Design an enzyme around this catalytic site. Structure first.
Site, PDB file in Angstrom:
ATOM      1  N   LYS A 137       2.807   6.554   4.337  1.00  0.00           N
ATOM      2  CA  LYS A 137       1.961   5.364   4.282  1.00  0.00           C
ATOM      3  C   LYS A 137       1.448   5.010   5.676  1.00  0.00           C
ATOM      4  O   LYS A 137       1.126   3.856   5.953  1.00  0.00           O
ATOM      5  CB  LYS A 137       2.763   4.186   3.712  1.00  0.00           C
ATOM      6  CG  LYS A 137       3.433   4.506   2.376  1.00  0.00           C
ATOM      7  CD  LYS A 137       4.502   3.486   2.007  1.00  0.00           C
ATOM      8  CE  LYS A 137       5.382   4.015   0.873  1.00  0.00           C
ATOM      9  NZ  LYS A 137       6.533   3.115   0.562  1.00  0.00           N
TER      10      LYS A 137
ATOM     11  N   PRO B  77       0.833  -1.221   0.000  1.00  0.00           N
ATOM     12  CA  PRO B  77       0.000   0.000   0.000  1.00  0.00           C
ATOM     13  C   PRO B  77       0.858   1.257   0.000  1.00  0.00           C
ATOM     14  O   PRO B  77       1.676   1.465   0.898  1.00  0.00           O
ATOM     15  CB  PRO B  77      -0.864  -0.051   1.250  1.00  0.00           C
ATOM     16  CG  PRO B  77      -0.929  -1.551   1.506  1.00  0.00           C
ATOM     17  CD  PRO B  77       0.463  -2.075   1.142  1.00  0.00           C
ATOM     18  N   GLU B  78       0.671   2.092  -1.015  1.00  0.00           N
ATOM     19  CA  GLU B  78       1.418   3.334  -1.123  1.00  0.00           C
ATOM     20  C   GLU B  78       0.495   4.492  -0.743  1.00  0.00           C
ATOM     21  O   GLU B  78      -0.639   4.260  -0.331  1.00  0.00           O
ATOM     22  CB  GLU B  78       2.010   3.445  -2.538  1.00  0.00           C
ATOM     23  CG  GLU B  78       2.961   2.260  -2.793  1.00  0.00           C
ATOM     24  CD  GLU B  78       3.665   2.275  -4.141  1.00  0.00           C
ATOM     25  OE1 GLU B  78       3.981   3.366  -4.661  1.00  0.00           O
ATOM     26  OE2 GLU B  78       3.931   1.172  -4.665  1.00  0.00           O
TER      27      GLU B  78
END
Length: 263
Positions: A59, A1-2
Site C-alpha cells: 500500500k 486504501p488497499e
C-alpha cells in the site's frame, strides 16, 4: 486504501504526470504527516524535477524523479491521490509544466509522506513482504509459508511483512470466496484450503485492479458490498453475514481445534 486503490493512483500518475517538470511545490506544514524532513527542505528538494515513473509495493506509493531523493506515500486510513483546492487537506502538492496539478490529501492526518534517497532500501518498504500482485507466491510456496504460522488467517493476511497489499476488505473477500473462517489458524489449513485461498487472492486482486478499484464494478456476489451494513441488515447472495470482520457462517465454518475452542 488497499492495493487496488493505491495501484489505481499509481496508474493515474503514470498516465498523466510523467515527463513534466515540477514548476511549483506545496508541502503542508504538518508535523504528523511529513515524516523525516521539514516541509521547506522537501519543497526545495523536488522543485524543478521531473517524474520518471510511479512505483508501488503493498500500500506504498513512490515517485521516481530524474534525480533522488524520491517522495513516498503511506496512505493510512484516508490518504488519496487527486489529479486536476489546493485543498485544505492537501499534504503534497505539485503543479507541472503543462498546468496539470497533482495532490495527495489526508483529512485525518494518519498518512506518512517521506523524501528518501532510495525508498526501497529503508523502512517501511524494505520490510514489506512480497507484493500480492507483482510477486505472488507459488501454490506450494504459499502452503509452505502457512504451515508454520500459528496465527489466525485474517490477521496474518493483514501482516504487511508476510504478504503486502491486503487490507480488511480484501481479507474478508478472499476468505469468504475460499470458504475459510477468519479465525482459522494458518498452520491448521489443509493443502486444499491453502490452494483455494491462493486462488481467491489472485482472482479478487486481479479483478479489483482490472476495474481500477471502482467498487461499483465489483462482482455482485462479493461480500464487499454489504460488509459495512448494520447487523441484521447484512446479506450476500441471500445468506446472512455475521461480524466479529465480515463473514458468512453458513459458508465459512471453523474446523478442528479452532472450532473446539470456539465452542
Amino acid at each position: 486504501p488497499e492495493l487496488p486503490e493505491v495501484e489505481a493512483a499509481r496508474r493515474a500518475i503514470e498516465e498523466n504526470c510523467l515527463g513534466k517538470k515540477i514548476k511549483r511545490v506545496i508541502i503542508a506544514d504538518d508535523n504528523k504527516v511529513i515524516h523525516g524532513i521539514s516541509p521547506s527542505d522537501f519543497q526545495t528538494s523536488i522543485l524543478g524535477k521531473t517524474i520518471i515513473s510511479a512505483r508501488r509495493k503493498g500500500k506504498n506509493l513512490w515517485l521516481e524523479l530524474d534525480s533522488p531523493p524520491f517522495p513516498s506515500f503511506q496512505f493510512g486510513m484516508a490518504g488519496a491521490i487527486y489529479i486536476k483546492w489546493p485543498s485544505k487537506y492537501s499534504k503534497f502538492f505539485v503543479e507541472l509544466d503543462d498546468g496539470l496539478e497533482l495532490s495527495f490529501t489526508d483529512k485525518r492526518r494518519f498518512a506518512k509522506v517521506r523524501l528518501l534517497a532510495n525508498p526501497t532500501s529503508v523502512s517501511p518498504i524494505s520490510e514489506l513482504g512480497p507484493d500480492a500482485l507483482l510477486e505472488p507466491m507459488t501454490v506450494d510456496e504459499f502452503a509452505e509459508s502457512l504451515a508454520k504460522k500459528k496465527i489466525t488467517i485474517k490477521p496474518l493476511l493483514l501482516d504487511q511483512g508476510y504478504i503486502s497489499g491486503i487490507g480488511n476488505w480484501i481479507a474478508d473477500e478472499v476468505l469468504y470466496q475460499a470458504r475459510i473462517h477468519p479465525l482459522q489458524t494458518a498452520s491448521s489449513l489443509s493443502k486444499e484450503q491453502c490452494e483455494a485461498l491462493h486462488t481467491s487472492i489472485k482472482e479478487v486482486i486481479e479483478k479489483a485492479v482490472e476495474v481500477d478499484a471502482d467498487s461499483s464494478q465489483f462482482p455482485s456476489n462479493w461480500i464487499f458490498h454489504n460488509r459495512e451494513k448494520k447487523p441484521g441488515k447484512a446479506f450476500v447472495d441471500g445468506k446472512k453475514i455475521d461480524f466479529i470482520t465480515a463473514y458468512v457462517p453458513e459458508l465459512q465454518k471453523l474446523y478442528g481445534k479452532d472450532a473446539e475452542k470456539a465452542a
